[PDB]
């Protein structure tokens, strides 16, 4: 099985300009949104039809109550952070928690906080400690580290709960998440600037988004400049990408255990 991940984000915004919610929380399985909540609706909602169909209303009800609490916590924490930094005006506080179930069956887990979009605190579940980026973060660290049981609870949640949630959601959405749509791949050739020929290897229509693409020279690796296009959502559930070089060339593509070679 391929690698899958479960991520929950939280975004807290101080004194938000007209429009932007004070608090937003969104969950993902891989690149797919699965749950949402914000301080305007004050309601937990599914963001995928396979979540909605497999979780009864009292689940949404229970997590509605939990997020309202987490919203309040996030608000207060942001106020204390602003005070520590002596900051006024509008600032942001973010949280990311989650886990990965790797191909080989091993796992990872992570829990991180950011302030104004920059790393602030990073949890190390193997020594049960928090990594602080500055003296303010260090203040919060000593507070969180003083609570031993709470450190253990978090390790348990990342290693066991998170993984069990992820397996549960993978099963709910398997027709979407475990499918394979192979790439359509083409090589385009063109003289650009006089004497300069550009080769583009372009792929589209593939799912999952993870794809490997490269250019080879005579079957061995190129030690020339390769430009890479981002992996971009095409809007229909599938993705597109490219790689290009200048001028025996061949484009190599790997996707979902299938290798492809396009010889120029």
């Amino acid at each position, epitope marked *: 099985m391929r690698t899958h991940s479960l991520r929950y984000f939280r975004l807290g915004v101080s004194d938000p300009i007209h429009g932007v919610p004070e608090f937003i929380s969104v969950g993902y399985v891989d690149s797919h949104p699965i749950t949402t909540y914000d301080s305007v609706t004050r309601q937990k909602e599914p963001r995928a039809p396979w979540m909605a169909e497999n979780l009864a209303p009292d689940h949404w009800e229970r997590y509605t109550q939990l997020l309202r*609490g987490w919203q*309040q916590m996030f608000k207060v924490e942001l106020k204390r952070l602003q005070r520590h930094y002596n900051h006024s005006g509008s600032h942001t506080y973010q949280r990311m928690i989650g886990c990965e179930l790797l191909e080989d069956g091993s796992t990872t887990g992570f829990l991180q906080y950011a302030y104004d979009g920059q790393d602030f605190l990073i949890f190390n579940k193997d020594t049960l400690s928090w990594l602080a980026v500055d003296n303010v973060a260090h203040t919060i660290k000593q507070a969180w580290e003083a609570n031993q049981h709470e450190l253990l609870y978090q390790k348990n949640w990342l290693e066991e709960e998170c993984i069990a949630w992820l397996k549960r959601f993978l099963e709910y959405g398997k027709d979407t998440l475990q499918r394979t749509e192979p790439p359509l791949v083409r090589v385009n050739r063109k003289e650009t600037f006089p004497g300069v020929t550009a080769l583009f290897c372009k792929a589209h229509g593939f799912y999952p988004p993870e794809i490997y693409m490269t250019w080879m020279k005579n079957g061995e690796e190129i030690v020339q400049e390769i430009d890479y296009g981002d992996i971009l959502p095409s809007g229909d559930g599938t993705y597109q990408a490219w790689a290009s070089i200048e001028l025996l060339y061949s484009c190599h593509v790997e996707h979902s255990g299938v290798h492809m070679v396009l010889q120029v």
Partner: antibody
Amino acid sequence: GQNIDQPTEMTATEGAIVQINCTYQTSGFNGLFWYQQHAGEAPTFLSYNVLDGLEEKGRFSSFLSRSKGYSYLLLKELQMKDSASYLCAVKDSNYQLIWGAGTKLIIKP
Amino acid sequence: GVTQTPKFQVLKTGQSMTLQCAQDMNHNSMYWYRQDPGMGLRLIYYSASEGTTDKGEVPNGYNVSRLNKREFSLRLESAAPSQTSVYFCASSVWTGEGSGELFFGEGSRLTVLE
């Protein structure tokens, strides 16, 4: 989750040892609590476990095995004043507390 | 840290009744339990933080209001004999913390008679 089981009652002798078991079958696990409740009083928090192992606080120890869905509360050098109910409670996936019906501990002088 | 009243009350059926609970620990979550012989504590209503409340396991015949951060009231709408019980208020710092324990009030002994 669904179910927590701890004995209704246990009797042991002053000066000796008693082990109070609590098994749980829950949907998810986020920790197991023990509470002491003297007759006519409020429960007071005794212990929390969420990973495997044993924690000692004075004469009381709490043990957890996540693999077996099992905890015990261990009391050493029993005293009359340990006569009380001991309540086992597990937090499930959705952070709800599921309460066992308590074990009444009777101490023989 | 958790203050709860009254410790005793006799009620005639159909009487209404409010139980009060206050907590000065700046806890965010509060709870109302009833305790009956031969079963574990049962959650009536709870309040995950200021400004929200929700049904617990046995909400019927009751309702609550989270008045402010400190206080969580329990109401018996039309008192019934089956509501003869021992009521416990409790708070914790948050809800959906793993290790956060409950702190309990002294309890309220309620007897409802015809």
